[PDB]
C-alpha cells in the first residue's frame, strides 16, 4: 500500500515534467506572438510523447570519457535526487512525514551539484569542464541565500517541519511578513535550476552538451523535476493554502493552482529578459542578495523576540 | 659532512627564493549561432 503511494508520487512527477515542456513551448509561443505545438497532438498534447520517444531511439555518443562510471552516475544521481526532493512535500500530507523536512530538502538540493560536476568530468572537453565549474559556482553561490532565507522564514515557522508550515500560514500568507525574503528566494531558486536569466548552458556551450538523447532526456527531465518542486516548495513556504482536514483536496487544488501559476511565472520570466553575464549574477549574489539576506536574517532573529511572537516548538 | 648520497645538494638561494619554474587560447570556430553566421574567433584569454 505504501508502494502504491510512492508510485502515485513519482510517476505523475515524470508526467507533469513531460507536459511542462508542452506548457513551456505553448506559453513561450503565445508570449512571442506565435503558437506553440498544435499539430502533433490535439492542441499539442502528444508533442512530449513524440519528443521523448524520439530521444530514446537516437544513437548515444558513448564518447571517450575520462570516467565511464561517472558518465553513468550523473543521470542516475540527477533523477534520484530530483525524485527524492518531493517525498517530504506536504500536499497536504507528505509521503514521508519527517521532523526535519526543510533541512532534508536543503541538504538533498545541495547534493545536486555533483551531477553538474560529474557531467563536466565525464566529457573530455575542457571547455565543457569550465562551463560545469561556472555552473557549480553559480549553484553553490545561490545555495547560501537559499539557506539563510529559509532559516529566516523558519524562525517564523517554529520548526523544520514542512507540515507545520501549513499551520503557520492559517491566517495570513507568509509572503506578507516576508516578501523581501520571498523575492530574493524566488530569484535564488531561479538561479539554482540554471534558469533564465541565470542560464549559462546555451551560450557563452554548457555542461550537458556531451549528452545526446539517451541520458539527456533524463537530465533535462530531472532538471525540470527540480523546477516544479522548487515552485511547490515556494508555494508551501510563502503562499500557504487553506487546509481543511476533512477535505484535503481543497488544499491539493489550491496549492496545485498556485504552483502552476508560479511555474508559469518562471516561464514568463525567461521570455522577458536577456541573460546575465556570469560575473553580473555573481555580483547579484555576493553584493546585493547576501547583505540584504544577512540584514533580514538579523531582523527575523530579533523580530519575534521584540513582538513576543516566538512560534511554537512543536 | 657530505656523503655519497648527500653530495648533489647545492645550497639554498641567499634570499631563500627559488625561481618559479601563460594564458588560455580558445578557438570558437564555425559551430555557433550567437556569432552572426560564419566566423572563426581565436581568443586569447587571461581568466
Amino acid at each position: 500500500m505504501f508502494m502504491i503511494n510512492v508510485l502515485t508520487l513519482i510517476i505523475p512527477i515524470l508526467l507533469a515534467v513531460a507536459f511542462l515542456t508542452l506548457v513551456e513551448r505553448k506559453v513561450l509561443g503565445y508570449m512571442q506572438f506565435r503558437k506553440g505545438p498544435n499539430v502533433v497532438g490535439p492542441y499539442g498534447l502528444l508533442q512530449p510523447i513524440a519528443d521523448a520517444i524520439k530521444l530514446f531511439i537516437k544513437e548515444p555518443l558513448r564518447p571517450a570519457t575520462s570516467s565511464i562510471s561517472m558518465f553513468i552516475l550523473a543521470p542516475i544521481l540527477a533523477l534520484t535526487l530530483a525524485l527524492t526532493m518531493w517525498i517530504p512535500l506536504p500536499m497536504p500530507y507528505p509521503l514521508i512525514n519527517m521532523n526535519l523536512g526543510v533541512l532534508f530538502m536543503l541538504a538533498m538540493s545541495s547534493l545536486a551539484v555533483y551531477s553538474i560536476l560529474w557531467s563536466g568530468w565525464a566529457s573530455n572537453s575542457k571547455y565543457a569542464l569550465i562551463g560545469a565549474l561556472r555552473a557549480v559556482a553559480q549553484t553553490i553561490s545561490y545555495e547560501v541565500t537559499l539557506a539563510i532565507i529559509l532559516l529566516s522564514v523558519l524562525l517564523m515557522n517554529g520548526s523544520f517541519t514542512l507540515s507545520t508550515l501549513i499551520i503557520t500560514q492559517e491566517q495570513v500568507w507568509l509572503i506578507f511578513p516576508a516578501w523581501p525574503l520571498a523575492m530574493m528566494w524566488f530569484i535564488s531558486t531561479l538561479a539554482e535550476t540554471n534558469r533564465a536569466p541565470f542560464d549559462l548552458t546555451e551560450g557563452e556551450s554548457g555542461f550537458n552538451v556531451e549528452y545526446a538523447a539517451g541520458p539527456f532526456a533524463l537530465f533535462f527531465m530531472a532538471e525540470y523535476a527540480n523546477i516544479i518542486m522548487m515552485n511547490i516548495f515556494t508555494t508551501t513556504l510563502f503562499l500557504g493554502a487553506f487546509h481543511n482536514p476533512y477535505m484535503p483536496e481543497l488544499y491539493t487544488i489550491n496549492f496545485t493552482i498556485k504552483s502552476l501559476l508560479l511555474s508559469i511565472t518562471f516561464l514568463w520570466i525567461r521570455a522577458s529578459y536577456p541573460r546575465f553575464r556570469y560575473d553580473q549574477l555573481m555580483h547579484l549574489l555576493w553584493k546585493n542578495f547576501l547583505p540584504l539576506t544577512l540584514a533580514l536574517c538579523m531582523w527575523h532573529v530579533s523580530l519575534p523576540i521584540l513582538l513576543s511572537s516566538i512560534p511554537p516548538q512543536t | 659532512y657530505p656523503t655519497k648520497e648527500t653530495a648533489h645538494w647545492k645550497p639554498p638561494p641567499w634570499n631563500d627564493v627559488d625561481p618559479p619554474k601563460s594564458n588560455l587560447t580558445l578557438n570558437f570556430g564555425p559551430q555557433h549561432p550567437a556569432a552572426h553566421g560564419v566566423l572563426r574567433l581565436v581568443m586569447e584569454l587571461s581568466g
Binding site: 512571442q32 498544435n38 524520439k54 530521444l55 | -
Partner: protein
C-alpha cells in the same frame, strides 16, 4: 502474418516520433538563414510542427544547410554533420547549397553541399521563401514517415 503487423505498427510509431520531433541545428551560412529565421518567425512558426532550433549538433536531428558552402568552411560543415547522432537528415536550402547557385563558377565555393554531406531534401530558390522551406520540412517529414526500418530488419 502477425510479427509483420507488429513491426509495421512499430515502424509507424518510431517514424511518427521521429518526423514529429525534428530538431534542426540553429546554423545558417548566408542569406538563406534570414528566410530560415522567417520560417522560425511567428507567421510560419516551425515550433508548432515540433520543429525547434537547438545550438549543439549533439541534440539535433536535421542539418538545414542554409547558405553558400565555401571551400574554407566545408571541413567545418562536415565536422558538424559528423557530430550529429543518427538518424540525422540534411535539408539543402537555396541555390548555393543545392548546386553553387550564383557563385557556381567561383574558385572558393563548393558546388553544392552534396559533395560534402548526403542530402535528403533539396529546397530550391534564391532564397526559397520561408513557406517554401516549411514545404521542404514537411516533405522531409513525409519522407521519414514512409521509412521501413523494422520491416527491412525483420526481413533481413
Amino acid at each position: 502474418s502477425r510479427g509483420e503487423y507488429v513491426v509495421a505498427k512499430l515502424d509507424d510509431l518510431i517514424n511518427w516520433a521521429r518526423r514529429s520531433s525534428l530538431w534542426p541545428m540553429t546554423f545558417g551560412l548566408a542569406c538563406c538563414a534570414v528566410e530560415m529565421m522567417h520560417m522560425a518567425a511567428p507567421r510560419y512558426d516551425m515550433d508548432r510542427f515540433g520543429v525547434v532550433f537547438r545550438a549543439s549538433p549533439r541534440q539535433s536531428d536535421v542539418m538545414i544547410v542554409a547558405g553558400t558552402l565555401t571551400n574554407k568552411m566545408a571541413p567545418a560543415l562536415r565536422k558538424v554533420y559528423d557530430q550529429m547522432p543518427e538518424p540525422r537528415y540534411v535539408v539543402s536550402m537555396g541555390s548555393c547549397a543545392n548546386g553553387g547557385g550564383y557563385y557556381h563558377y567561383s574558385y572558393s565555393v563548393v558546388r553544392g553541399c552534396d559533395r560534402i554531406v548526403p542530402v535528403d531534401i533539396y529546397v530550391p530558390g534564391c532564397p526559397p521563401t520561408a513557406e517554401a522551406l516549411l514545404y521542404g520540412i514537411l516533405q522531409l517529414q513525409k519522407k521519414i514517415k514512409r521509412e521501413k526500418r523494422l520491416r527491412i530488419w525483420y526481413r533481413r
